[PDB]
Design a protein around this ligand. Structure first.
Ligand SMILES: O=P(O)(O)OC[C@H]1O[C@@](O)(CO)[C@@H](O)[C@@H]1O
Ligand SMILES: O=P(O)(O)OC[C@H]1O[C@@](O)(CO)[C@@H](O)[C@@H]1O
Ligand SMILES: O=P(O)(O)OC[C@H]1O[C@@](O)(CO)[C@@H](O)[C@@H]1O
Ligand SMILES: O=P(O)(O)OC[C@H]1O[C@@](O)(CO)[C@@H](O)[C@@H]1O
Ligand SMILES: O=P(O)(O)OC[C@H]1O[C@](O)(CO)[C@@H](O)[C@@H]1O
Ligand SMILES: O=P(O)(O)OC[C@H]1O[C@](O)(CO)[C@@H](O)[C@@H]1O
Ligand SMILES: O=P(O)(O)OC[C@H]1O[C@](O)(CO)[C@@H](O)[C@@H]1O
Ligand SMILES: O=P(O)(O)OC[C@H]1O[C@](O)(CO)[C@@H](O)[C@@H]1O
Ligand SMILES: [Zn+2]
Ligand SMILES: [Zn+2]
Ligand SMILES: [Zn+2]
Ligand SMILES: [Zn+2]
Ligand SMILES: [Zn+2]
Ligand SMILES: [Zn+2]
Ligand SMILES: [Zn+2]
Ligand SMILES: [Zn+2]
Ligand SMILES: [Zn+2]
Ligand SMILES: [Zn+2]
Ligand SMILES: [Zn+2]
Ligand SMILES: [Zn+2]
Lengths: 332, 332, 332, 332
C-alpha cells in the first residue's frame, strides 16, 4: 500500500520550506484542489446528475453558459475565498473582478477559467479548469487593476484536466510537475517531476475549419506540415477541441498548438487572463514557447480582464519555425 | 436518492422479456460491464499505478502493445469466458481466434478491441473498448470462421468510452441507448434513450496530416467543408485521435468521421472486425451511414479476422455528400 | 491488477452450472447486489446526505421508522421486482406481503429486513440487510401464505454487512461463502470460501440489561460463562447491538449469540421470517446450531409474516450447552 | 451540488483566524486527514487486499501486531513527519518515542494509536485511529519526556472511526465537532457542531466477561444498572469491543463506558497516552467526565509512554454515580 504518499500539498510545502513564506500559497493550492476534486466527481457523473445543458445566460465574452460552468465557478469562488489567501479574483464567468471581503483577504490575485472546453462537455471529451496566480503588487485597496498584470508576473499557474484520468499540472518559478488524482483517497499524487517539452514535435493542432480566415503565415505553416519541403514525414494532426486537452498533449508529446488571429478575429478567440497566460507560463517553464505570432504572450500588458489574444505554443523549434514565417510575411 | 435505478442489466432484461431468449445475452453484457468497470478504474489512476508504457510486444496489425492493452485484453477475455455465453473470441491483441473451452461455451462470437485509442493513453485523452457480438451460425465445432461474418449479421455492438465520464453505448436490432457509469455504486445507468443522429452535422473529423496521401475525393470534400460553394458557414474541425471518442461525438453532435484509404494504405488503417463493424452498426441503428467510400461497411464479408477497412460514417446527408464525390471521381 | 476477478455473479453461475436451472436465482442475487451497493453508498455518507433521523411512522412490529429504512426498503423492493425472479415479498417495513405484478413474476418468495440494527445507525456502528429466499411451493395465485414456510425450506439466505468493509454472506444448500464489496468497481468479490464455524467459541453475546427478565436457564448460562465450574478462562463478552454484526462475528470467530425470550417477551424480539430464519440457515450451513431454547428455529411453521421468535445460535458445543440447561429447567 | 463545502481544513482555519497562529496545527490536521483517508480506503477493502492477519511481532504492551497496525502506523508516521508540525511522536506500535529529524521539526508532540480495536478487525466491526496533540513545553532537544505530559495539557485530541461511515471527531479548547468523510471527493465535511453529551444516559458499556475480577464498586454499579433500586427502567447494554466505537456511541447517545482496573490488572488495560487521554479530553470538552475511579484521567502525570490506566467515561451523572460507589467502598 501507499504508506509514504507524495501529495501536491507535501510537495509544495517541501520545496518552499527554506523560502520561509507566509504559507498561504499552500492554503491557496489546497483550496483549489478541493474544488477540482468536486468538479471532477460531478463531471464523472454529469449525465446521471442531469448536469448537461445550458444555464440560461451569456458571459461577457459571449459564451452561452452551461450548468457545469456555474457549478464549477461557484465551487472555485467559494474555496478561494475560504482560503484566506486571495484578494482579487477574475473568472471567465464573472463580468467584473471579485474583490475578496476584508476579513478573508490574502495577498494573491487569481485568474481562472472554471470550466474550459465548453463545446466538448456533452460528448464526454476532456475538459478542465485553468488558473493563474499573481501576488498583489499595489498597496492600494484591492481592485480589478490588480489582475491587469502581464503573465511574466505569474508566481504560479496550471490546470486541472478531467480526462481519462484527472491531472493537476502545476508550474512555478523553477518548473512543472504533474499530479494525478487518486479517486480512492481524494489526493493529488506526484506522477511526473520537472516536465520538459521536446525541442521539436511531430503533431500540429489547430481548427482547420477556419482555413478561409487564416492569415498567409498560418496557411503556409500548415501546408508545410502536410508537404514537408525536405521530404521528412508530415506531422500528424490532433485537435480535441478543448484548450486544456490539446495543450496538455502538446506538453507531454511535444509539437505545436494554435489558435491564431484570423481575418474575422484580430485577437483570436482564447482569453489572455485565464486561458493564454496560464498555459503560456506552463509552456515556458517546460522549456517551450508561447507567442501571438508577433510578441510573447507573457509580455502583453492587459487592459481588459476579458481581453482575447492569439496563441501559438509548444516545442520551441516548432513555434520558432512559425514565427519565422510570420516575420517573412510581416508587412509594414 | 436512487431507489428505482435503471441499469443496463434491467434495461436489457426488460426489452427482451417477451422474446423468451436463453438469457445469455444478458449474461454476456453483465460480464462485459464488469471488465469495463475494471478497465475504467485502472485507467482513472494509470499514472499512480504505473500502467503507462509499452508491454514489449507487437500485435498482428503491427501496433506496439501497451501495458493497458494487456490488462484490458486479459480482463475482457476472462469475463467473457466466465459468462457461459461465448464460443469464439476475436481480439486485436490475439493473433488467432480464441475458442472457448467446451465447458464454458455459449452461442455468441465476440469481436473486440480491448483498448482503442493507443496514441492518446499517455496524454490522458479519451480512450475506450469496442465490441461486436454475433450468434454462432454454423453447426460445426466453433472456429475462427465463425467470426468471419459481415457486420450486417451483428445482433449487438457498442463501446465503452473512458472520457470525462465513462459511458457504455449499446446498439441492438431496435436502436441505440447510452448508459453512464455511476462510480459510487458501480452500475451503468440509462441516460440517453433511442439515440438518433442529426440528418446533417457541421463538424468533419479526419487526420489532415495525411493530406499528401488522400485520394481526390477526400481532398475535394475537405476543401468543400472549408470553402462552402454555397457560402454557408464552413464546418468546424475536430479530431481527438481515438476512434471511440471521435465516433461518439459524431453520434451525439452529428457530422462526419473519416479514416479513408490513402495512396499508401489501400484498406485504410482501422480494423473491420473490432473497430469498423461495431461502429458501423451503432451508426446505422442511430439512422446514420457507414461506408468505405464504395460499399457499405456492414456488407463486407471478411476473409481475415485482422483485415483493415476504410471508414466514413456519421450523419446520412454528410456521408452521402462524400459518396457522391467518390462516384464523381470513380474511374473504371 | 485483477484481470481474473471472482465475483458473486460468476461464483453463483459456476456452481449451479450443471444443475441447469432457469437462471433466475442469479438474476435475483444480481438484483439484490445492486440494492446492497446503493444502500452501502448511502450509509457511508448518511450524515452528509442528511439521511439520519426518523421518517415519521411505525411498522407493524412497532419500530419507529427511519429515513434509511425507507430508502433501503424501496431500493430492495424495486430491484427484486425488476429481477423477474420473484412473486411474493415480505419486508419488516410492509404491513402485508407484496404480490409481484403478473408481468414481472418469478418463482421466488423473498423475506427481507431492509435495514437491520436500527439503534446503531446514528452512532455509526455496523448495520446491514438480511434476506431469505424460498421457491413458491403452491400452484395457487401468489399470496402471503407463500411466505409462511418453515426456514428449513429456504434455498438461499444471507446478509449484507455495512461494517468497516461491506460484506455479502451467502448460504445455499451446500455451504456458506463471503464476498466483500470492492468500492472501486462495485463488485462483490469472493474472500472466504466454505466458511465453517468453530465447534466451540469463547465469546457470548447478549444484552445483559434484561437480566431482571431472563429465565433461569439464560441466567445460569451467563453465570457459567463468567464463573467456569471447571476453572477454565471465562468467555469474553461482545454485544454490538445490531443482529447482523453480532451474528457475523459469531460466524467467523465462533461462540454464541442470544436474544432469548424473557419474562416480558414470550417470543423474544427478533422476527422469524426476515431475521431469525435467514441467520439460522446461515448458521446451520456453517455447521452451527440455531434454537429458541426448545426447538430448532428452521422447523417453526410461521402463522404470521411478522411473528417473533427467540433465538440462540452459534458454535454447536455452546448452543448445546445452553439447550442442556434449558432442559434441566424444563417444567411440565 | 456542494459548491460551498465546509471541510475540516476550512473549519479549523476559520476558527483560529483571529488567534494568529503559525498555522502548523492546520498543517498537522491536514496531514492526519490524508493518512486517515488512506487507512479507511484500505480497511474498506482489507479482505480483497489480503490485509487481515498478523504481521509477526509483538508491541511493548504485548499485543500481537496485525498487518493493518503496520500499514496504519507507517501511514501516520510518514504524514506527521512531512507536516513540518511535529517533533516527538508516540505510537502504540513503537517501543520508544520517535524524534522528528531537525529539518522537518514542528512544535507539536503527537501521541497516537494507529489502529484501535484489534480484536474486531477480522469480523468487520468498527475500528479507528486515536490521537492526542501537545505543544512541546521544554526548550531542551526534543525527547520522549515531551510526551510525558498530563492530558489536561492537550491542545487537540480526537479520533477517526471507520464504521458504517468514516468520521473524524475533533476536540479543541472550545469544544467538539464531528466531520464525516465524503468518499467521492475525499474530504471530511462538518456534520455535527459543538457536540454535547447528555447529562444522563441509559446505556452502560463494559466487558462483563471479567466479572470474576471486578472490584466491588464496578460489581455494585452493574447490578444497579440491571436492577434499579428506584424501579426505573434498567439500562440497555452495548459493548462493541473497540474503544473508539464504544466511546463514540457514548458521546452521541450518552451513557457510560468502562474499562476498569480488575483483580488481575491494577491499571486496567487501555493505554493512557494514546487511548485514555484523547478520549478523556473529548469527553470533557463535550461536558462529560472521565475518571479512573479515584482521580481524573487528564490529571495523571505519566511516567511511561506506554503506561496503562483504568477508565470510566461518559455522561456526568452516570460517571458521578459510579464515583460515589467507589468512594463508598474506599478502604484506607
Ligand atoms: O508561502 P507563501 O508566502 O504563500 O509563498 C511561497 C510560494 O511562492 C511560489 O509560488 C513561487 O513560484 C512558490 O515557490 C512558493 O510555494
Ligand atoms: O437471451 P438471449 O437468448 O441470449 O438473446 C436475446 C437478445 O437478442 C438481441 O441481442 C438482438 O438484438 C437482444 O434483442 C436480446 O437481448
Ligand atoms: O437458476 P435457478 O433456476 O433460479 O435455480 C438454481 C439455484 O438453487 C440454489 O439456490 C439452491 O441452494 C442454488 O444452488 C442455485 O443457484
Ligand atoms: O496555528 P498554530 O500556531 O499551529 O496553533 C493554533 C491552534 O491551537 C488550537 O489547537 C488550541 O485548542 C486551536 O485553537 C488552533 O487551531
Ligand atoms: O471551436 P473552436 O473555435 O475551435 O474553439 C475551441 C476552443 O474553445 C474553448 O472551449 C474556449 O471557448 C477552448 O477550450 C478551445 O480550445
Ligand atoms: O494517428 P492516426 O493515424 O490518425 O490514427 C488514429 C486511430 O488510431 C487508433 O488508435 C487505432 O490504432 C484509432 O483509435 C484512431 O482513430
Ligand atoms: O436493544 P436490543 O433490545 O438489545 O435489540 C437489539 C436488536 O434490535 C434489532 O435492531 C432489531 O430491532 C437487532 O438488529 C438487534 O439485535
Ligand atoms: O477484549 P477486551 O479486553 O474487552 O478489550 C477491548 C479493548 O481492546 C482494545 O482493542 C485495546 O487493545 C480497545 O479498543 C478495546 O476497548
Ligand atoms: Zn466559455
Ligand atoms: Zn476556456
Ligand atoms: Zn470556460
Ligand atoms: Zn492497437
Ligand atoms: Zn482501436
Ligand atoms: Zn486497441
Ligand atoms: Zn426495525
Ligand atoms: Zn433487523
Ligand atoms: Zn430492520
Ligand atoms: Zn494493540
Ligand atoms: Zn487502541
Ligand atoms: Zn492499536
Amino acid at each position: 500500500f501507499d504508506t509514504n504518499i507524495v501529495t501536491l500539498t507535501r510537495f509544495v510545502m517541501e520545496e518552499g520550506r527554506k523560502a520561509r513564506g507566509t504559507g498561504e500559497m499552500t492554503q491557496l493550492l489546497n483550496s483549489l484542489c478541493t474544488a477540482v476534486k468536486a468538479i471532477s466527481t460531478a463531471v464523472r457523473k454529469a449525465g446521471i446528475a442531469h448536469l448537461y445543458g445550458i444555464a440560461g445566460s451569456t458571459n461577457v465574452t459571449g459564451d452561452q453558459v452551461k450548468k457545469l460552468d456555474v457549478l464549477s465557478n461557484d465551487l472555485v469562488i467559494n474555496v478561494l475565498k475560504s482560503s484566506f489567501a486571495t484578494c482579487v479574483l477574475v473568472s471567465e464567468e464573472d463580468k467584473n473582478a471579485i474583490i475578496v471581503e476584508p476579513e478573508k483577504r490574502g495577498k494573491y490575485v487569481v485568474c481562472f477559467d472554471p470550466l474550459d472546453g465548453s463545446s466538448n462537455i456533452d460528448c464526454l471529451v476532456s475538459i478542465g479548469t485553468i488558473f493563474g496566480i499573481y501576488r498583489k503588487n499595489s498597496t492600494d485597496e484591492p481592485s480589478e487593476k490588480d489582475a491587469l498584470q502581464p503573465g511574466r508576473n505569474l508566481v504560479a499557474a496550471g490546470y486541472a484536466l478531467y480526462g481519462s484520468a484527472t491531472m493537476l499540472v502545476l508550474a512555478m518559478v523553477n518548473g512543472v510537475n504533474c499530479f494525478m488524482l487518486d479517486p480512492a483517497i481524494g489526493e493529488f499524487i506526484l506522477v511526473d517531476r520537472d516536465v520538459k517539452i521536446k525541442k521539436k514535435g511531430s503533431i500540429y493542432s489547430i481548427n482547420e475549419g477556419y482555413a478561409k480566415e487564416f492569415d498567409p503565415a498560418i496557411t503556409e505553416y500548415i501546408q508545410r506540415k502536410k508537404f514537408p519541403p525536405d521530404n521528412s514525414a508530415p506531422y500528424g494532426a490532433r485537435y480535441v477541441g478543448s484548450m486544456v486537452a490539446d495543450v496538455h498533449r502538446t506538453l507531454v508529446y511535444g509539437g505545436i498548438f494554435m489558435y491564431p488571429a484570423n481575418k474575422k478575429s484580430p485577437k483570436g478567440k482564447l482569453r489572455l487572463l485565464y486561458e493564454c497566460n496560464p498555459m503560456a507560463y506552463v509552456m515556458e517553464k517546460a522549456g517551450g514557447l508561447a507567442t501571438t505570432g508577433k510578441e510573447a504572450v507573457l509580455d502583453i500588458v492587459p487592459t481588459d480582464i476579458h481581453q482575447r489574444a492569439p496563441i501559438i505554443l509548444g516545442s520551441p523549434e516548432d513555434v520558432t519555425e512559425l514565427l519565422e514565417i510570420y516575420q517573412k510575411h510581416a508587412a509594414k
